Amino acid sequence: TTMRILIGLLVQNPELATLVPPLENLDENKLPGLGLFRELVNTCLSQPGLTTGQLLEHYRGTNNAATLEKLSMWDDIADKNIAEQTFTDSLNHMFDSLLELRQEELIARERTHGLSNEECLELWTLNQELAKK
Amino acid sequence: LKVPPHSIEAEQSVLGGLMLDNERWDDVAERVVADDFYTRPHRHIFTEMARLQESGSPIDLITLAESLERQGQLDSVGGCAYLAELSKNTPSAANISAYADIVRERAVVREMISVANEIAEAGFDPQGRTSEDLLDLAESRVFKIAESRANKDEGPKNIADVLDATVARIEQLFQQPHDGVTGVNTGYDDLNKKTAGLQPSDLIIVAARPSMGKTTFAMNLVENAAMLQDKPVLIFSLEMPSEQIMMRSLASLSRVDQTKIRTGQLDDEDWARISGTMGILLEKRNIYIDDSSGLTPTEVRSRARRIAREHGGIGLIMIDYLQLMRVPALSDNRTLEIAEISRSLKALAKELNVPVVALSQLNRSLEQRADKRPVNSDLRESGSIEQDADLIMFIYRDEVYHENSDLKGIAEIIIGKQRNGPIGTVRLTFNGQWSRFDNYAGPQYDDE
Amino acid sequence: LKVPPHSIEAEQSVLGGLMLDNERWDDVAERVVADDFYTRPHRHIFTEMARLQESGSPIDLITLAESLERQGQLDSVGGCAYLAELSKNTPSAANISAYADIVRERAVVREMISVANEIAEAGFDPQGRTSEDLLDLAESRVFKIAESRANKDEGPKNIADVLDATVARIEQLFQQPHDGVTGVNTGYDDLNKKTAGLQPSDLIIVAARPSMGKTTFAMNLVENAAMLQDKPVLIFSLEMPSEQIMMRSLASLSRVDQTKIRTGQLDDEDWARISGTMGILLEKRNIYIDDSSGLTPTEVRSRARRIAREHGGIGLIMIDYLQLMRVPALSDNRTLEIAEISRSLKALAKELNVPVVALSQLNRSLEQRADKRPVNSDLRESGSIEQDADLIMFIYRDEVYHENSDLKGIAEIIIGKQRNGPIGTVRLTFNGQWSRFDNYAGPQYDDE
DNA sequence: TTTTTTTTTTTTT
Numbered sequence A: 001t002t003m004r005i006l007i008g009l010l011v012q013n014p015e016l017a018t019l020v021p022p023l024e025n026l027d028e029n030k031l032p033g034l035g036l037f038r039e040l041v042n043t044c045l046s047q048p049g050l051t052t053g054q055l056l057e058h059y060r061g062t063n064n065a066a067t068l069e070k071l072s073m074w075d076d077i078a079d080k081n082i083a084e085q086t087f088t089d090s091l092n093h094m095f096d097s098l099l100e101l102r103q104e105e106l107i108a109r110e111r112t113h114g115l116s117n118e119e120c121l122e123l124w125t126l127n128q129e130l131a132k133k
Numbered sequence B, C: 001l002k003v004p005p006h007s008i009e010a011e012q013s014v015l016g017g018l019m020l021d022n023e024r025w026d027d028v029a030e031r032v033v034a035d036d037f038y039t040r041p042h043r044h045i046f047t048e049m050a051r052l053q054e055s056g057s058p059i060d061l062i063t064l065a066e067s068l069e070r071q072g073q074l075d076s077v078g079g080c081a082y083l084a085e086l087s088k089n090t091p092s093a094a095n096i097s098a099y100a101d102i103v104r105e106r107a108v109v110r111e112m113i114s115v116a117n118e119i120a121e122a123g124f125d126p127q128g129r130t131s132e133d134l135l136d137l138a139e140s141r142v143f144k145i146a147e148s149r150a151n152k153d154e155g156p157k158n159i160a161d162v163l164d165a166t167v168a169r170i171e172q173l174f175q176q177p178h179d180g181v182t183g184v185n186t187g188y189d190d191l192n193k194k195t196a197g198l199q200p201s202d203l204i205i206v207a208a209r210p211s212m213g214k215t216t217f218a219m220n221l222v223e224n225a226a227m228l229q230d231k232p233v234l235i236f237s238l239e240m241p242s243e244q245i246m247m248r249s250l251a252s253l254s255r256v257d258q259t260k261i262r263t264g265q266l267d268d269e270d271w272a273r274i275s276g277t278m279g280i281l282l283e284k285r286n287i288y289i290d291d292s293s294g295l296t297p298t299e300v301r302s303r304a305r306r307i308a309r310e311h312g313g314i315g316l317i318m319i320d321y322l323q324l325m326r327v328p329a330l331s332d333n334r335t336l337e338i339a340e341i342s343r344s345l346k347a348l349a350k351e352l353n354v355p356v357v358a359l360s361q362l363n364r365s366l367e368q369r370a371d372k373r374p375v376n377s378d379l380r381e382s383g384s385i386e387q388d389a390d391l392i393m394f395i396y397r398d399e400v401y402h403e404n405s406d407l408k409g410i411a412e413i414i415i416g417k418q419r420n421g422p423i424g425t426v427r428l429t430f431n432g433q434w435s436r437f438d439n440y441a442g443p444q445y446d447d448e
Numbered sequence D: 001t002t003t004t005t006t007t008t009t010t011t012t013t
């Protein structure tokens, strides 16, 4: 899954969190374990320029630290630019998931009571992102 | 139970793709039709799509939904959600050709299966039909299957089509004023008069006895081609390391005694020349060397394809030499192995539309004759080397055999075969010290 | 049940990325193969992926699903759901190269374990196999795995890379003031001038008619090389016993009539000379002699490597002579057997980076001519002897053929071939009594 | 078991 890889990239490269757009605009329950990712970004933004060890030290007393440590150990990539590119395209993938979930809901509402011209027109516009390539 | 073949997902993709880009409409239309689908609603959608296209309406979700709603088939095919899902599962519109090709294949198989069922039905119940009639129906059905293909296999072609293509080729050759060199420039004007350059899709061959200049001449052709065009040239050196080849090239281009280069006893001027040569080569950067040993025909084709794909095509490829390649499948019979290699090299040239220069060795029977110039039937192990080749050039240096020869340092390029063109001899000065063949400026001796 | 070493996660990443992108197929094709994958389902998918790619078709879930369905492997791999699941799980394909490498590493390690199991099983059940059979089997497998791990270097290289390496080497030789001694020092002034010593990675050939001075000249090269360097020199005397070889060399170095040594009729002064020679030889101790008969090319390679590994490299190798080696597999076709021997010797020279001097023999056709100087095409059974050799030296003593010859006691070394360098003739003085060739101090005659 | 094509060495007219 692309969720576990995100935190692994997050923990191994803390500075990547700096360029992460806000996520509070969306319900964290939409993705599994999404709230923690947003927790890390604000934590990084709380003290910009933080060491990798310090980032994990922020949650020393928490139980989820074990998952963070395992992800740090897994997928160790010496190159930094590649990791940044992987994080960036991954962040796009999550945005695709959000739009994908939205259109699935909009399909569900269509079955409930149908849709108007604006709604189906908006759905049509919602397929370009899922087929941008 | 047996389910007739079909690809619902491919049917979804072809329907989905065209709604974004309609430029590929002809590609889908010519390849497949609404009869190819296995699901009826998809047939309805495509029939509507074709109608809208014929009416000039752009192919899109809104137009399709409007047409279906007006015709009342929207409910049968689904709706906004169903049609939206159609485009949702499309991986990429550019691939639509493969999806269309898949759909055609599924329809063809379904057509064949139906024919088989029809044949079985007719056979089981004669219904008053005699044995001969049953044969006729099978023949007619088989012919229809071979007829519905719409070529796809390059069957016999009428002469009117061939004439139109050939005359077009001649007319365009007229416009470009190359004046003799239709193919790659060899670099030796006396050689261009006969060969007219190295034509694409050719299997050229350079043969001679050991230490006659076979690799020295081929490298001169490669150097001249690289400096006289812009496409990459690929070298397969199965006999020598890349360093030795480059040491010769520096000696040839910079005209410095290759003994000094190999030994390191270079002066200031020699360093100046070599620096000049290095600058030129690094400015172009269109020569690739692969010194791996014992390559099979498959490895040669794969590597050449990659270079062509990455750099926009090849201009020439050289192999050194033919007999060192291996075909592990055919290792018990050396004659079959060599025939397979030669066929593969000819096929590769056609595929990439590039001239292939493959060197070859010669038999020892040449050395038992009073006259020691090579002939076509001297190529070593050569079952089909003489038959597949379109041009064969032999290198002969008379000074090697007769010490008191008058042709001291005058090599001869004997053209032993040329499918489309004359044959003859060309004389070139041989400067071994520089590892070079030069134009023979001396008086021209008429060839007999 | 010890867990075999494998990594499913790397395989899943590789397969998913290839689904995402098609431009990296080459990146993985070189690195991994279908056999590399652990689980059979992955092996089936890769085989189908390769079949689609070599067909020049796009790679996608729909195409793969149909292709696997065609062969009936769709259900076996796990159904279309598994492929859809795998495509879903893969974010991108940036680090596929690393994933490809680990997958390659796992297979090699698994290959290593299997070989270890096979050797252990064979030892437990010899099935009549002797210790030699087991040792040869163990050596063969370790070599095979070693070769397998050494296939990565292959691939065409640009000219910028080759130019940098070549110029670097030329700079090195320029710094060293060796003054013509680039390889091993032959010990003769004229020979060094025409060849610049014996170069590493070469296959030199010494040929002549029976009883011409062929083993006498080769031993002189071995002696002179041994005293002019510090690396071991290895000798393979398939013809004569080591005692007879040492008897000759003790006569040549000490300049004592070898008849006296052979029959033991020496004097005090002769005993003084032999004592001096023995002291010098034992001071260096860098000559090894192997007089086993009928060795195969594998045995020659195996023994050469052991010497190189123990003493840190070999400075020269001598084989006496080429046609006495054996290749049991090609025991029917003599011509192919000799061709395989020549190919192996050249490969051995390249691997160790050492000059390999191999003696050969000439044909009887030479003796039916008016002129009896050797030529290249006289090498016996020479399928490829004259083709692979980088340098060929013939020994000619006119005295043997013309009893009134003015060239009494003078030997001609005829350089019949030299891939990188000129050719010509060199004259030495032959002292049969001492089994020695001395550089010719008499008047020098120009070479035509 | 038979037919084919390529190498290399000998002996005879």
Ligand SMILES: Nc1ncnc2c1ncn2[C@@H]1O[C@H](COP(=O)(O)OP(=O)(O)O)[C@@H](O)[C@H]1O
Binding pocket: B208, B209, B210, B211, B212, B213, B214, B215, B216, B217, B258, B259, B432, B433, C418, C419, C420, C421, C422, C423
């Ligand atoms: N420095 C030199 N001076 C004179 N001749 C040379 C020199 N270097 C190489 N040659 C000659 O160039 C000839 C061609 O070599 P090469 O192209 O390797 O032959 P092939 O590739 O046909 O076996 C050889 O016969 C060799 O004698």
Ligand SMILES: Nc1ncnc2c1ncn2[C@@H]1O[C@H](COP(=O)(O)OP(=O)(O)O)[C@@H](O)[C@H]1O
Binding pocket: C208, C209, C210, C211, C212, C213, C214, C215, C216, C217, C258, C259, C432, C433, C434
């Ligand atoms: N004591 C001697 N006096 C004169 N000639 C000798 C003496 N010992 C050896 N020779 C000659 O040295 C020649 C070279 O022998 P050798 O190198 O073994 O021949 P091959 O080239 O077959 O190895 C022989 O032909 C022999 O006549």
Ligand code: ALF
Binding pocket: B209, B210, B211, B214, B215, B239, C386, C387, C388, C419
């Ligand atoms: F030495 Al060659 F062809 F005989 F390269």
Ligand code: ALF
Binding pocket: C209, C210, C211, C212, C214, C215, C239, C361
């Ligand atoms: F005695 Al020989 F070749 F004739 F070693």
Ligand SMILES: [Mg+2]
Binding pocket: B214, B215, B216, B239
């Ligand atoms: Mg060559």
Ligand SMILES: [Mg+2]
Binding pocket: C214, C215, C216, C239, C320
């Ligand atoms: Mg001998």
